[PDB]
């Protein structure tokens, strides 16, 4: 029956990511607490009502195919449905476990994706976790040659969570992984222009106020890109440029649309070219900007079939000419011209000149110095910087392939050849490329903005293992968030809480601060009072205000420590010191202290 | 000092609001051009109420000026005449703003012209203060100081000759 099943399944469009459908023509809601009975009843209702009889017959034929015959392919697909909630079926986390277990039995530890998913599920104890079985599964899955597995194992040896610390193993593994990655790029993608992938490394819960209150959390907001912005004649070009931009680097809500911007720029250039002269006041600036963006677009070939070399070349040289007067920006154009005349035509010295022209600019991120170093290495007789100097500057800047080339150079060279630095470098490269290792962020966000909250929990959790901090804080925030004052704390199961703890705290050890405060409040609500102060002190050692105040409130009440009002006053002085806007609160708290002291002084 | 009490209270509350940018300052500065294309007389009443007022010094100004306004309003139970004259003053100032669009807010202009009106019908620090400072600030424009002091005594002269007729 399986062939007919599959021929039917080709007709339902498993999953829709509106982040792209929004490109043809916001925010969301998270849950606060949880109940297993509640979700059982919800899923029962969904099975009762919303499902179409077509889906009824399809699912029944599928389960009959999977049970009667060990088809080993109706099993897997049904697992994938009941996990990712594709083809508009609900989420069951208990059933997918069973089916994946059966699949593992069938193919006898050879299909590594099921190994990965099953290992994660055993490591978080969704269904009691038992790290031994999880680690054996991770070993077995690394043997077969799955990248994500080797990554998470290397990481676990680098952050020392759950195992002894080891720099050498993480080093070797990351070297291997970066190798397999570098073999994944073509000679063109790597050298010429990097393939530009929509990053979703944004941690959730910045679309809301933030973590631990607004105007209060130390680590700066990280929502790099969402709807950039800033009366009849001029503002036309303003609106047109910003619309172009917004439709080039797609936002979080709506992905990019390439061809749209292409046609629009073609239009506006063809319309404004003959009398460009008259727009000196300010429209010159934005016109040059649009022209540069269009030329870059042409050179890449995005939004079309193939690039236009000579067309874009003349486009950009004219852009430069116009910019010579009115002294507009010169960067993107010069960069791209260098890219062209370095590879397409073989004139180097002018390319060198151009790179020099763009070096000290702003919009240059790293391509300048990378290309510079490559050339200087290929021709040492040009007397153009020092390869080490260039590559180090590059890596410091933030361009991807620079990392790998820099690590390659630094491993062969002493220049402080400590193992920690090489480990850090390989780690940063590996986890930064993000378009092969971490695609599931997209599916996560998608399931997020369309009412399927649980699967988002799963995906974010599975990622958190790999070290993508932002995933860690996200999964946490989905599992337990801070309640407003004089309002009930959430009513979720404990195991939920204990996972949230470990996630938050590892996020803390990663480099982020605020989360520690959340973990502390979590222990506090759990009534431990004992280890919390550890976290609080560690955070205060990085100047966390809320942490310090909370430390005070810990001391001055009898929990743990016993009523040292002196140190309490000291801490409140300290908080009033490091920051200004909290003067009032410091003083008012001091006054509560003094009143308590008088009231005891009377009796 | 009923109506003057309301005047100074509205003045100070608008000073408070604009001091904290609770209301968008781009709307209260609405001049004849802005109100005229927009039809927003509420901004004209605001400009009668406010100065872009945040200055403690301007607060002193409000206090002593409203004192003067009381010194002027008290002497007449012919307050219907006060309404007449303030309305005509308002409209002629609107026309002269259409010609000029001065910088100062309308509150300064209204109070100053009422003071000059009563001063030409007939402590002492503040009236001569305001006369001199406004003479200085708008003597630079041919018709700004006109709006400052001419129309008030224009109305008073009409009232005077009506008495004489």
């Amino acid at each position: 029956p399986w062939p007919e099943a599959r021929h039917l399944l080709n007709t339902i469009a498993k999953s829709r990511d509106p982040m792209k459908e929004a490109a043809m023509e916001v925010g969301f809601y998270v849950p606060m607490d949880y109940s297993p009975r509640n979700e059982e009843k919800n899923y029962q209702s969904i099975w009762q009502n919303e499902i179409t009889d077509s889906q009824r017959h399809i699912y029944e034929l599928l389960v009959q195919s999977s049970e009667q015959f060990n088809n080993s392919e109706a099993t897997y697909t049904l697992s994938q449905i009941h996990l990712w909630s594709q083809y508009n079926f609900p989420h069951n986390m208990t059933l997918a476990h069973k089916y994946l277990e059966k699949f593992n039995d069938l193919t006898h530890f050879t299909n590594h994706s099921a190994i990965f998913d099953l290992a994660v599920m055993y490591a978080t104890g969704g269904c009691p976790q038992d790290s031994a079985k999880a680690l054996l599964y991770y070993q077995r899955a690394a043997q077969l040659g799955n990248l994500k597995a080797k990554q998470v194992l290397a990481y676990k040896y680098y952050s020392g969570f759950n195992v002894p610390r080891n720099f050498h193993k993480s080093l070797v593994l990351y070297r291997d992984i970066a190798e397999q990655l570098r073999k994944s790029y073509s000679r063109d993608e790597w050298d010429i222009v990097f393939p530009y992938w929509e990053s979703y490394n944004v941690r959730i819960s910045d679309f809301e106020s933030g973590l631990l209150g607004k105007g209060l959390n130390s680590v700066p907001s990280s929502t790099v890109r969402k709807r950039t912005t800033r009366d009849a004649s001029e503002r036309r070009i303003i609106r047109i440029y910003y619309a172009a931009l917004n439709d080039y680097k797609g936002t979080y809500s709506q992905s990019r649309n390439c061809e749209r911007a292409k046609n629009l720029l073609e239009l506006t250039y063809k319309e404004f070219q003959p009398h460009v002269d008259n727009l000196d006041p300010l429209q010159v600036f934005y016109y040059v900007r649009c022209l540069q963006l269009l030329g870059h677009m042409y050179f890449t070939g995005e939004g079309s079939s193939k690039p236009n070399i000579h067309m874009a070349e003349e486009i950009l040289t004219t852009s430069l000419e116009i910019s010579r007067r009115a002294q507009g920006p010169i960067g993107r154009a010069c960069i791209d011209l260098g890219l062209i005349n370095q590879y397409i035509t073989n004139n180097i010295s002018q390319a060198i000149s151009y790179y020099m022209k763009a070096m000290k600019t702003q919009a240059n991120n790293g391509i300048v110095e990378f290309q510079l170093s490559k050339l200087a290495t290929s021709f040492p007789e040009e007397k153009i910087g020092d390869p080490f100097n260039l590559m180090e500057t590059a890596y410091l800047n933030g361009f991807i392939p620079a990392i790998y080339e820099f690590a390659v150079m630094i491993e062969s060279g002493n220049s402080k050849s400590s193992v920690e630095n090489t480990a850090y470098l390989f780690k940063t490269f590996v986890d930064k490329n993000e378009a092969i290792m971490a695609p599931k962020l997209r599916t996560a966000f998608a399931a997020l903005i369309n009412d399927r909250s649980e699967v988002a929990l799963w995906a974010y959790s599975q990622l958190a293992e790999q070290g993508y901090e932002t995933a860690q804080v996200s999964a946490a925030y989905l599992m337990y968030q801070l309640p407003y004052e004089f309002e009930d704390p959430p009513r979720t199961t404990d195991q939920r809480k204990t996972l949230a703890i470990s996630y938050y705290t590892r996020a803390f050890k990663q480099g982020n601060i605020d989360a520690g405060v959340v973990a502390g409040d979590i222990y506090f609500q759990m009534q431990n009072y004992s280890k919390a102060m550890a976290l609080y002190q560690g955070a205060a050692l990085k100047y966390s205000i809320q942490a310090i105040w909370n430390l005070g409130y810990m001391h001055e009440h009898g929990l743990g420590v016993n009523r040292d009002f002196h140190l309490a006053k000291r801490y409140y002085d300290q908080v009033s010191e490091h920051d200004h806007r909290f003067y009032l609160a410091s003083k008012l708290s001091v006054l509560k202290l003094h009143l308590k002291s008088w009231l005891t002084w009377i009796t | 000092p009923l109506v003057t009490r309301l005047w100074t209270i509205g003045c100070l509350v608008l000073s408070g609001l604009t001091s904290l940018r609770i209301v968008d300052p781009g709307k209260v500065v609405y001049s004849y051009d802005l109100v005229f294309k927009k039809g927003q007389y509420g901004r004209l009443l605001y400009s009668i109420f406010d100065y872009g007022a945040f200055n403690w010094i301007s607060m002193i100004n409000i206090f002593v000026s409203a004192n003067h306004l009381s010194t002027l309003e008290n002497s007449f139970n012919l307050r219907r005449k006060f309404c007449w004259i303030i309305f005509l003053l308002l409209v002629i100032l609107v026309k002269m703003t259409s010609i000029e669009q001065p910088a100062a807010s309308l509150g300064v202009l209204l109070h100053e012209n009422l003071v000059y009106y009563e001063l030409k019908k007939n402590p002492s620090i503040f009236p001569i203060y305001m006369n001199a400072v406004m003479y200085f600030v708008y003597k630079r424009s041919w018709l700004e100081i006109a709006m400052n002091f001419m129309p008030g005594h224009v109305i008073y002269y009409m009232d005077d000759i009506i008495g004489k007729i």
Partner: protein, 45 residues
């Protein structure tokens, strides 16, 4: 100076004439010399 009194004099008295425009313009010229109320008090005299 009685010369300002000559300026006060108007064409074709009395105030009941049609030359009220002449009245108001004479009055605007007197307004030009508003610097001293000494003329306003004397108007009655």
């Amino acid at each position: 100076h009685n010369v300002l009194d000559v300026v006060l004099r108007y064409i074709i008295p009395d105030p009941v004439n049609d030359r009220v425009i002449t009245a108001v313009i004479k009055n605007f010229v007197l307004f030009w010399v508003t610097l001293l109320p000494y003329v306003k008090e004397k108007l009655d005299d």
